[PDB]
Amino acid sequence: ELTFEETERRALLLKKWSLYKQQERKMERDTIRA
Amino acid sequence: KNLGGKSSGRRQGIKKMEGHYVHAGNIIATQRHFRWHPGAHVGVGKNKCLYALEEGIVRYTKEVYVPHPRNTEAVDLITRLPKGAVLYKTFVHVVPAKPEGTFKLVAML
Amino acid sequence: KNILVRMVSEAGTGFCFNTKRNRLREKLTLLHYDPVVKQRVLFVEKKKIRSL
């Protein structure tokens, strides 16, 4: 079983990882094009 | 050595060309494969024959082909089609002539 | 191979319809529409008319 607080923290974890790896792929593609 | 091949012609094909007045139920075209696809107010029999579902004028058009999502073979064909490509097929439509009916004064209560 | 079997209505009606089944399968029972009763009723295989 689990709780609302940890579920919210996991959702925010997924959100921040989405942002982080989006920036990673953006910089990778920028280097590729350059 | 070669036996058979004596079958006669099926006499299939178009029975009503464009511009022909067609009554409900009339067979527009009989085909072995789907040469002409059913358009508006045109139904398909078990044997792929096209019959007019309404009373009107037959019109042949070229229309984009969008197969049913469960038609697996056609869906695979589309999935393999290049982007920007659109399939077209010949459709038979029956443009209804008469209205469904009229409102008539029956009783002046 | 299959056989043609006369399925008879269990509704007491003398309604029979012929179906086909494998010769090596058990005696066949269906739920078929009985026009006399105007309702789906159980039909049980009674006899084998012919082997097809």
């Binding site: 919210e8 959702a11 | 009554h23 409900a24 358009g39 508006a40 009373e55 019109r59 042949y60 058009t61 070229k62 229309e63 984009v64 082909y65 969008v66 999502p69 869906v75 589309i78 999935t79 393999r80 089609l81 290049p82 982007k83 920007g84 490509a85 659109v86 399939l87 077209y88 459709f91 439509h93 443009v95 008469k98 469904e100 009916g101 009229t102 409102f103 008539k104 004064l105 029956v106 009783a107 002046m108 209560l109 | -």
Partner: protein, 324 residues
């Protein structure tokens, strides 16, 4: 023979030997989108349609969206798929912002413009809130093409159009019993002093809708005209007749249609009372008559036809005996 195409053949530009390199529709959804776009696009061959056919606002909206995102409870509900929307507030904002356009679309679909104004259109900028008082407690609103029974429409409606000289006109578009191209005027309040409507001039008294029985669904339109400068206007059915097109042709310079609201009505016992008492007539009853079934010319020898063939052409089902 091979006549050349009269235009760009479909799938011509893309076609090239680099099929392997070309990206492909991996999804029936994207293929369907492209196919629908192509179908909408015009073509030179016979087709189905031929035969059957500011910055402040942006800044404020961005700030509001940022505030909503910041509100954690909103994000919690969104990720828990439990958040809802205030329907009444959404409706009010729709009215204020984009309601006129959707209402114009509804009017065009219902054919109000093609009938009331012979095609000429207009965005109903001014919202028009009409409601027929039901009982002494509630009231049925008339938004756009909704259904209101003549019983409910028995008494004149309450109108609240928020503005600051107006003319209100109720027109039945298809209730005419004698003329296909004609209207019925039910009430015409001219030179109304702003929001308040009781002070309007009663050019024609209110007459409740009377859609004849079995005559189908009728459409009734509330036309509100903003009146630039006040102007003078000019139970008998011959004088209740009306042509809104001609009326607006006469009053176009001083009038501008700024509000619209219509509803649909079908026959009712109140219609019976309207016909018998108010109009003093025998109510007409209409029926939908389908065309007689088509049968091919009777042949002397109906080869291979079933015995029902003769019944298809006999007119009387009762036995007949000729000279005997």
């Amino acid at each position: 023979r091979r006549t050349p195409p009269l235009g760009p053949m479909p799938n011509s530009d893309i076609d090239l030997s680099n099929l392997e390199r070309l990206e492909k529709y991996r999804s029936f959804d994207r293929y369907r989108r492209r196919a629908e776009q192509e179908a909408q696009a015009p073509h030179w061959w016979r087709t189905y349609r031929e035969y059957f056919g500011r910055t402040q606002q942006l800044l404020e909206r961005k700030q509001a969206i940022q505030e909503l995102r910041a509100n954690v409870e909103e994000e919690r509900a969104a990720r828990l798929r439990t958040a809802s929307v205030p329907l009444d507030a959404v409706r009010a904002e729709w009215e204020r912002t984009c309601g006129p356009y959707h209402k114009q679309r509804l009017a065009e679909y219902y054919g109000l413009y093609r009938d009331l104004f012979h095609g000429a259109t207009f965005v109903p900028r001014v919202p028009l809130h009409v409601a027929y008082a039901v009982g002494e407690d509630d009231l049925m609103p008339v938004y756009c093409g909704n259904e209101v029974t003549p019983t409910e429409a028995a008494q004149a409606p309450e109108v609240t159009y928020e503005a600051e000289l107006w003319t209100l006109l109720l027109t039945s578009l298809d209730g005419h019993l004698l003329e296909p191209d004609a209207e019925y005027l039910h009430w015409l309040l001219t030179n109304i002093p702003g929001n308040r409507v009781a002070e309007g001039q009663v050019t024609c008294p209110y007459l409740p809708p009377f859609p004849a029985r079995g005559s189908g669904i009728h459409r009734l339109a509330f036309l509100l005209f903003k009146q630039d400068q006040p102007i003078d206007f000019s139970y008998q059915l011959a004088q209740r007749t009306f042509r809104t097109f001609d009326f607006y042709k006469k009053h176009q310079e001083t009038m501008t249609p700024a509000g619209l609201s219509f509803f649909q009505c079908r026959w009712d016992d109140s219609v019976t009372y309207i016909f018998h008492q108010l109009l003093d007539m025998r109510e007409p009853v209409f029926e939908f008559v389908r065309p007689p079934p088509y049968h091919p010319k009777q042949k002397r020898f109906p080869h291979r036809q079933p015995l029902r063939y003769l019944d298809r052409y006999r007119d009387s089902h009762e036995p007949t005996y000729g000279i005997y």
